[PDB]
């Protein structure tokens, strides 16, 4: 085999504990290069004469270029040393250890996970493990209070086409009045973009972190929303913009007024006084030259303490978690301490980050619980919407992403289809509902947390921002209730099948020609197979099904009963039809 | 080329800052697959059409199977996105980015280092970058006070052969009395194995963390050692055993007495009660069933606070650093907070760990400054002492180890030849002094911090523990002063040749037949080439020396001047001779 292509490291995403006495280990090798991967291990202080325990590393998956092997090590001493025994297609074997590769075990050396501390076991909120989150863009969801509308608010109608500076009056009172709707839909949590006091239309340039923006509501109303959502089994997640503040932030205005005499000049990154200009600025800001968004020096103990107080304040209001904005630009220590604070106040508070690149540095268990799965969105867009990639590529992309982080993170990644910053998925699908539905079916049965962008469930459409921010369609006759019932049904299924929320994922079938992809979700003895016919043609396929997993399945969407003959399952799917096969266990 | 063997990650040892505006990036590829590696980068918010910056990545080295390329990205904005352009032997142009490999730059995507915070720039003590440490085993270095000698103390003679339970009377006063000797040698720091109060001979089972063991001295004496050492330019490093305490430790004694009602039960890992008995252990200990060494629950904030107080106490006594014992079995948060405490009290205090496996998880810059370089010892033992490996293999092992961690850690790793737990290095060489000297010449000119085991500088020999712990030889007649002068000379050169303490390392020549290895240490315009003729034969070697780095060199050990002709340097080395060639810059 090709030894230079084989990889493992005793940490990060390749070695991490799932409990105090169990260590998961993963290894990658060029696809097809390794046929068998076994792990020989023992306590780090074990005598050189004792027998080593054995652990077979099953092939957890494979992407465009690699095969991924995964094993679980039982380490009652919480300390383990181990070496891999690798076998190729032609029977050639080799030991792989920290020292390197060798036909002799001793010369391969041994990898070591020094000690498994209970406090370092990646732990996430149980409720987030089976949640369906709904993204609320406040200004455009529901206008429950006309008296707080910004001046110049435009009419709330389906034919409305939003302009960058448009206003429709969406607010918290509206969300409250519409909680019955969200409850009927079945969402378990609401995620809000920024809602704190700000002079702009977007609110990403915070003026007051301790107040709800007047156009959206106030503290008493927010408290009411939290309470009303909670009794309906709906949690509240707020967006925290801690990387930078608005130029109206008390600390910044003070600096603008006193210059180098400000007690807060060091809460920011200023090059030289006086501090200001139009399109030009002597201080660091979000992105490039954004005057209204001065970057905060979170490394400053005072800044950090202040933001922590902000976090305490909202959590005292009863919120259930945070979505962090531009989190990759605030330091790690802040995030490690943020987590300690947050979890001490509420062990079930969720911490989600938004990083548009490999987020492994924030997903080891000491910082965020998860991040936005932009990779999922990209794979779903190109597979279901644009048709730029086929089923096998879709499979590879999905798998590569899956292997990026420890299972505790991957399990809670927010899998979005779109956002207030993208065109709506329906529009990406060129208005084709059959394509849109297949994507939703996949979204609701795949590994991760489904995130619904407001209005998508009733068939809203729209080009990218600001056209994706049209006012929510509330007139029942103008909503797509067929789609709505589809989401509701899929959501009910996700909650009834433990596999869909807490199961692992394995590719079941991938055909680039028929463009059919199938995968299986598994937990204990339960298996739920999902078959996706992503083609505008009726197609027949033969899936492999060794009798050990069962020989009878029920399509949870139609009630049809299918049977495997001699370890094979023949299926005929209608155009863009998706089946959710439950093995009855 | 083998794409599955190419590696990089935007963190850890492959992407890290050396300053607030400079990011070092490294890439690994199968040896020979890549002949040219360039990096195209820009600010993360740069417009798609803006011109990308260029940085050529020079080949930093090669080990058994891979080439390692390194580049320095200039990032004024402290935010950077980048993609590699790899050129193969046949001129194939391959782009490599977060997305993957592609012939098109856009499809390869881009790696991203979101933000460079000054607090995350790995920083180590300046004095430690050019230090020469001396390991003192207190019981055997010098007996300055017989009144504290334990009963049964044996004769202090060169012909003494220690037994497991022998006693010779070494103490702190002794060290003070011998400071003139240590100052002459030129050592800048003293590292002590455990010296706190303990009932055993070894003292790894701590009875009182706040007291010097009576047989070694008292607090007033320790203070005198700190002050006297300091005025001699010698710092003091203590061994901290925070993973476990002794069964005589007050908290544990209390647990053994009050059991379930003990205020300190959660300070340890207790299975059941009664707390203990002879030959039976119901509590976790260091290693396996070591009743005298109960593991401390450093995750317990009370234990943490107590150990931190211990650290505060000794630092108040003016010590300059800590060598951690069994550090990999104490949690990371404890080490991160420990570093924060230590550096806040004394930014120049050093923190060294002892981990017998990849220690990258502790060498990112937020925990330890360095660790013991056991890989260095293994390589020099096989290359210089036993002859198990040749020059090219030696080159490989060195290079591989060098690429394990960020440069700030590699630069300060403790390069030891032996220890109180191993046979003496001279003995490893079978008493061959010529071999011993070449290894020391190497130790004193290589990347890292030279650690001298007490007595090696005057020719002491010995089998492994306890024979390596013989009474220091203080009779000038019995000391190998020739060797002593050799050590003094090398330490002197190390101090005046900046490239030897702060320069990078680059293999210059490696030949498995002649068993000759040469490397170059570089800092700015200064180059110091070390040529090691590790063979019992006078040999001639032709080294490549492109005129850009100089045409004339001075061998700092002989005063011999050598000249290059047409980009080549002809050298003739005697058996086991080493040359230290300074380019006069
Ligand atoms: Ca309103
Ligand atoms: Ca004594």
Swiss-Prot record, chains A, B:
It catalyses: Hydrolysis of pullulan to panose (6-alpha-D-glucosylmaltose). The keyword Nucleotide-binding does not apply. The active site is at residues 325, 354. Substrate binds at residues 244, 323, 420-421, 465, 469. Its EC number is 3.2.1.135. The record marks 421 as: Transition state stabilizer. One of its GO terms (biological process) is carbohydrate metabolic process. Ca(2+) binds at residues 143, 145, 148-149, 169, 171. Binds 1 Ca(2+) ion per subunit. Keywords: Calcium, Carbohydrate metabolism, Glycosidase, Hydrolase, Metal-binding. Hydrolyzes pullulan efficiently but only a small amount of starch. Endohydrolysis of 1,4-alpha-glucosidic linkages in pullulan to form panose. Also cleaves (1-6)-alpha-glucosidic linkages to form maltotriose. Monomer. Belongs to the glycosyl hydrolase 13 family. This is Neopullulanase 2. It comes from Thermoactinomyces vulgaris.
């Amino acid at each position: 085999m090709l030894l230079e292509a084989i990889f493992h490291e005793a940490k990060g995403s390749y070695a991490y504990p799932i409990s105090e006495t169990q260590l998961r280990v993963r290894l990658r090798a060029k696809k097809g290069d390794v046929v068998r991967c076994e792990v020989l291990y023992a306590d780090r202080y074990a005598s050189p004469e004792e027998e080593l325990a054995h652990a077979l590393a099953g092939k957890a998956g494979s992407d465009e270029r690699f095969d991924y092997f995964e094993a679980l090590l039982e380490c009652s001493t919480k300390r383990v040393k181990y070496v891999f025994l690798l076998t190729g297609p032609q029977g050639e074997a080799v030991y792989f250890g920290e020292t390197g590769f060798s036909a002799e075990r001793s010369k391969a050396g041994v990898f070591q996970y020094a000690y498994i501390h209970r406090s370092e076991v990646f732990t996430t909120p149980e409720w987030a493990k089976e949640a369906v989150i709904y993204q609320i863009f406040p200004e455009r969801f529901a206008n429950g209070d006309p008296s707080n509308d910004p001046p110049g608010t435009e009419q709330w109608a389906k034919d409305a086409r939003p302009r960058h500076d448009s206003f429709y009056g969406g607010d918290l009172k509206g969300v409250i009045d519409r909680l019955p709707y969200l409850e009927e839909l079945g969402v378990t949590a609401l995620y809000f973009t920024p809602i704190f006091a700000s002079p702009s239309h977007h609110k990403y340039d915070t003026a007051d972190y301790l107040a709800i923006d007047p156009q959206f509501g106030d503290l008493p109303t927010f408290r009411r929303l939290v309470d009303e959502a909670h009794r309906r089994g709906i949690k509240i997640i707020l967006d925290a913009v801690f990387n930078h503040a608005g130029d109206q932030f008390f600390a910044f205005r003070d600096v603008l007024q006193k210059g180098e005499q400000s007690r807060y000049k060091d809460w920011f990154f200023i090059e030289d006084f006086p501090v200001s200009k139009t399109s030009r600025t002597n201080y660091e800001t979000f992105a490039v030259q954004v005057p209204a968004m001065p970057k905060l020096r979170t490394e400053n103990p005072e800044v950090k303490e202040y933001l922590f107080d902000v976090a305490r304040f909202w959590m005292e209001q009863g919120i259930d978690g945070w979505r962090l904005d531009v989190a990759n630009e605030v330091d790690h220590a802040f995030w490690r301490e943020f987590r300690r604070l947050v979890k001490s106040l509420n062990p079930d508070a969720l911490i989600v980050g938004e990083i548009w690149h490999d987020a492994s540095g924030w997903l080891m268990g000491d910082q965020f619980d998860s991040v936005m799965n932009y990779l999922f969105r990209e794979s779903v867009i190109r597979f279901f919407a644009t048709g730029e990639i086929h089923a096998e590529r879709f499979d590879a992309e999905l798998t590569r992403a899956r292997m990026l982080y420890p299972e505790q993170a991957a399990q809670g990644l927010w899998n979005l289809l779109d956002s207030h910053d993208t065109e709506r998925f329906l529009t990406s699908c060129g208005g084709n509902e059959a394509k849109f539905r297949l994507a939703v079916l996949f979204q609701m049965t795949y590994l991760g947390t489904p995130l619904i962008y407001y209005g998508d469930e009733i068939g809203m459409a729209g080009a990218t921002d600001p056209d994706c921010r049209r006012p929510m369609i509330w007139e029942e006759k103008e909503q797509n209730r067929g789609l709505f019932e589809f989401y509701k049904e899929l959501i009910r299924l996700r909650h009834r099948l433990a596999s869909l929320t807490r199961g692992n994922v394995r590719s079941w079938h991938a055909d680039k020609q028929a463009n059919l992809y199938a995968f299986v979700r598994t937990v204990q003895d339960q298996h739920v197979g999902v078959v996706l016919n992503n083609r505008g043609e009726k197609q027949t396929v033969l899936l492999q099904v060794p009798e050990s997993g069962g020989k009878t399945w029920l399509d949870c969407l139609t009630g049809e009963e299918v049977h495997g003959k001699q370890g094979q399952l023949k299926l005929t799917l209608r155009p863009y039809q998706g089946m959710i096969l439950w093995n009855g266990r």
